[PDB]
Symmetry: D2
Amino acid sequence: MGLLEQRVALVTGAGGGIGRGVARSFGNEGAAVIIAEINESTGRQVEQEIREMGGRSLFVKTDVTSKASIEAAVRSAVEQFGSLDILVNNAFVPTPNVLLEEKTDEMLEQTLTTSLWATWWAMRAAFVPMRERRWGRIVNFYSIDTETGAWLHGDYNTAKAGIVGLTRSAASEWGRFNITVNAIAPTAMGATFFELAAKNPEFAERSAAARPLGRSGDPEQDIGPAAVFFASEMSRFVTGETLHVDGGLHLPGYNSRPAGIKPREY
Amino acid sequence: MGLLEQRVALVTGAGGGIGRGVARSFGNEGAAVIIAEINESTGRQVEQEIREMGGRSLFVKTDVTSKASIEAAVRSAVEQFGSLDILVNNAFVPTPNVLLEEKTDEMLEQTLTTSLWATWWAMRAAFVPMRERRWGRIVNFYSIDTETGAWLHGDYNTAKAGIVGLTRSAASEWGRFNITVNAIAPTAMGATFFELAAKNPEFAERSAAARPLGRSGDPEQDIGPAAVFFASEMSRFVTGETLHVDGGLHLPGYNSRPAGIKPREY
Amino acid sequence: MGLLEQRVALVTGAGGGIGRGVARSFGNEGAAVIIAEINESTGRQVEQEIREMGGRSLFVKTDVTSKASIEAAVRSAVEQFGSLDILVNNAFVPTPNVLLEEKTDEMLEQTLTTSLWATWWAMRAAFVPMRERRWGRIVNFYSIDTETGAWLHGDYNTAKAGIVGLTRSAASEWGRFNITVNAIAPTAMGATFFELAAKNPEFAERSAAARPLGRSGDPEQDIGPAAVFFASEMSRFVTGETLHVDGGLHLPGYNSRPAGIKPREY
Amino acid sequence: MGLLEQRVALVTGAGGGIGRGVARSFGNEGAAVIIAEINESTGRQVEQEIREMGGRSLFVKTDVTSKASIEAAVRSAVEQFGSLDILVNNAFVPTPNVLLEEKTDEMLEQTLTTSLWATWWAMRAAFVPMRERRWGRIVNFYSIDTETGAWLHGDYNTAKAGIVGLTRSAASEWGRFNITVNAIAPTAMGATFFELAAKNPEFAERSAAARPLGRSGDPEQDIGPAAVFFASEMSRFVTGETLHVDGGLHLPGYNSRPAGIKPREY
Ligand SMILES: NC(=O)c1ccc[n+]([C@@H]2O[C@H](COP(=O)([O-])OP(=O)(O)OC[C@H]3O[C@@H](n4cnc5c(N)ncnc54)[C@H](O)[C@@H]3O)[C@@H](O)[C@H]2O)c1
Ligand SMILES: NC(=O)c1ccc[n+]([C@@H]2O[C@H](COP(=O)([O-])OP(=O)(O)OC[C@H]3O[C@@H](n4cnc5c(N)ncnc54)[C@H](O)[C@@H]3O)[C@@H](O)[C@H]2O)c1
Ligand SMILES: NC(=O)c1ccc[n+]([C@@H]2O[C@H](COP(=O)([O-])OP(=O)(O)OC[C@H]3O[C@@H](n4cnc5c(N)ncnc54)[C@H](O)[C@@H]3O)[C@@H](O)[C@H]2O)c1
Ligand SMILES: NC(=O)c1ccc[n+]([C@@H]2O[C@H](COP(=O)([O-])OP(=O)(O)OC[C@H]3O[C@@H](n4cnc5c(N)ncnc54)[C@H](O)[C@@H]3O)[C@@H](O)[C@H]2O)c1
Ligand SMILES: [Cl-]
Ligand SMILES: [Cl-]
Ligand SMILES: [Cl-]
Ligand SMILES: [Cl-]
């Protein structure tokens, strides 16, 4: 049997990258998948892809910077498929890669909204049907950058670290309802990867060689199954955890100092 | 020879609790201490305490929810004493201790403002004189609650987790200017401690027994010297770290489930 | 399809407890399971249980305190079933629960042998067939006690912490052969649990209530699937990780100070 | 007033490298320093340097692979200076830098003896006078390699990870006597550094540039003061902690794959 049969999942930002890989992976395991995506073109594409592969899916245009929009997508999951068993908080909006003192307050506010507030709003909305059914899986996304303090990502590192604190808090409190809450730090060939690869011909080589498994991540084949684990009965005794799904990159780390910045100015 | 001679420090929320203990410890090590405190009465009391003990201090009324007020306090430090070598981000405002699904968006916004934004604004303001002088020490405060996901503190846990991500980011980037950035997770007999002790006669004894060193922390004698370490040349090769200053409490943890909550409702 | 079809697993100490639960889980996912167990009676029992459920299994008497016995068990897996794709280092022997200064050198030697050396020897023996096929999954077991410094377990805590260092080293180096290496910190109802439950009639209910999910772990249903994840293609991009499979216990921790010990003696 | 006045410290392997830097730092803070070192020439050199600088010192020929030799040095500290308040377990013996599958059992046994057993024996011997006086500081040394799984160091990574488990165990239990136990992960220009620098002309510059503070560590000026912190009243409320003293290297990590090893062979 598929690992997610008779379950309903909502994946934010599922039109592309890791969210698309997770949504397709979920569809192949029997889940009804809500594609909660702001891009109507790519959201409907993934909806149709899951259906063509024999799965159940529904695109709901969703802007995770709006609490009302998130609540409406959660209501659609429950109304159209009968439950919302699985929540994946994946959507991401980049800010310019600039040094910390060059980041603006507007960048930090935008990143807090699209990462942290989006996760807060979706978790609290999904909590209601999960609590009623005494079964839930919440899969949040953070980043290895929160642990390395990666250069140029100061606002992102701050918001995604906040997501870890929220993950642990909900895991602690909501386990009494058989709702588990965990966070994945993935790396994969998503939109950022292809942007970096287009600008630097040696980027992909160095990125693959940077990690113990010596290769870059595929969203569906490499990240998908880890989300399935955390969305299924297989992780029924796991809550409050962080897991790196990154080819082992978390072991060596990576030095992200930009080329034009001297290591020592004192 | 005091460990902070000829250095200037700004401590937010230094009118009481841990901030007061840190400020007094800094004064005894020869630093000029700006008491960046919103409560005029307690802020002036600590300024005078440091002076009466032979140190240098200046109370500067500061509201860390206002970027302009923080920036004005940083200018006051440089104008009055010639530099701002050391920044301690300590100020705290509580929200109601309620279950995560009962926290309001307003509570999370307030906690993000008083903890995370306050730290962000003060770090970037203090960065300007620190960069120019190629010497800086930033000491942020987070909490063991971010690691246990402590019940009833979901907003606090989220914001203080963000502080850790911000600490690592600035440590990574600003080391090129000999600015170090570290975070302390303290426990001590502050305002929260005495409130809890007043409602529960056995609280203080159980709190001391909960940890390996078997006693409760004194702000000035137990937290103060850890702050002095991270504000001095002793920590000149330490950056991006988290240190628990808690009698060892981080080892056993603590179970924070409220008495009236059934551990299993499924 | 079963998640481990056409794969061969060797589980040390699989005659009882978590090892038995993992071996039965593996058999139900299509793996041929070598029961590498020192107790012939329980080892054969588990072999026969897996066969009666429609799986493939072979009991091989193995003493993990002997390098030659481990090497022979690895040869038995390859000779009988054609490969050795999955290694689970689970076997355990207790030492007396005594204060750290009362542990003997002999106790530390014994625990280093049964935990650390057993894992070292088995990993290096299994490496040969895994490298040959460029596919391997190694699952090591450590303990939350290594992170809390649990009282009375000082030798165990030391050896199991060593396991984490060895896990990360092999993950770092052997990823180039598509061998992944991860460690689980489980809690479940094994031999120790039932010993404690027999000596204390309220132990089970207190142990279940100590964690966010509010229930004790079943070896097969709660730990089994986490081992399956780390033994399968689902974890193909995960290596060098530690995962707590414990109902969330790692969040609150637990205070293990014995009842008769005064918390403060100074 | 020195931070270690009227205290007595025993530093293993204090004839050179970090041990020598810590011993000299301790002497300048007023401690009587026992140089527990196997090299008579360098041990006596460091003894004379501390005495020439106005400090108190005694070289005791000590081989940390021998429990009796460790016990004799502890007895000499108590007899000759009246106490043994501070223990620093620093000694190190290298094994060949070879791939994990090429390490021998003899190498793991040797590293377990010189790192782990030496620490176990010295901790339990120093415990006796520390407990009697209800005051103790134990400073153990582990390594960032335990966290990155650094290539070619598999035996060292395993033993030093064990040190962390032992550190947490003793912190948990021995705090009741006001004995704290902490572990530092340092990097500095010790014997290994100068060997690497001599074999590669660009090693030192690249090693300095690999970390946020952009410079390599000096044993006395950079590591010494962190050991003083953990050996003094300043850390009286800190126990069971790990602290990186490495210029921030723990943030980016480092990729230790050897030049001639393929990142991917599958
Ligand atoms: N790709 C990596 O290597 C990597 C590394 C670390 C962390 N992550 C994290 O994994 C998750 C996915 O990363 P990715 O690389 O696949 O991203 P991506 O850029 O490839 O896709 C992001 C998706 O989110 C959609 N989206 C943007 N704004 C939205 C909004 N308001 N509302 C709803 N949807 C919106 C986008 O249209 C897009 O489909 C993110 O949380 C990311 O931070 C990824
Ligand atoms: N005391 C503990 O056990 C403990 C535990 C974990 C974390 N912490 C953290 O340590 C730090 C201090 O804790 P505490 O218990 O001593 O707090 P406290 O409540 O005793 O003191 C807080 C100080 O902050 C001042 N303040 C409040 N709002 C302010 C504002 N806008 N602007 C300027 N000043 C303001 C207050 O007037 C007060 O003087 C906090 O960051 C706290 O989160 C403390
Ligand atoms: N059960 C828990 O809560 C828990 C908690 C933390 C860690 N662990 C770890 O999980 C693993 C299993 O724990 P468990 O509680 O199921 O143990 P258990 O005591 O129930 O089973 C141990 C098995 O190991 C076998 N064995 C003993 N010595 C052996 C030897 N030389 N050679 C081969 N087999 C031998 C035993 O005969 C037995 O079948 C262990 O590594 C343990 O340290 C368990
Ligand atoms: N230097 C670094 O960058 C670094 C990095 C990570 C960890 N460490 C750790 O810090 C500590 C010191 O490192 P280092 O580079 O200064 O080492 P080092 O090689 O420079 O000095 C080692 C000292 O130990 C002495 N010694 C060797 N065997 C001994 C024995 N049986 N008994 C007593 N003394 C003995 C040596 O004679 C020497 O004086 C070690 O524990 C090391 O693992 C250092
Ligand atoms: Cl990748
Ligand atoms: Cl306290
Ligand atoms: Cl359990
Ligand atoms: Cl260095």
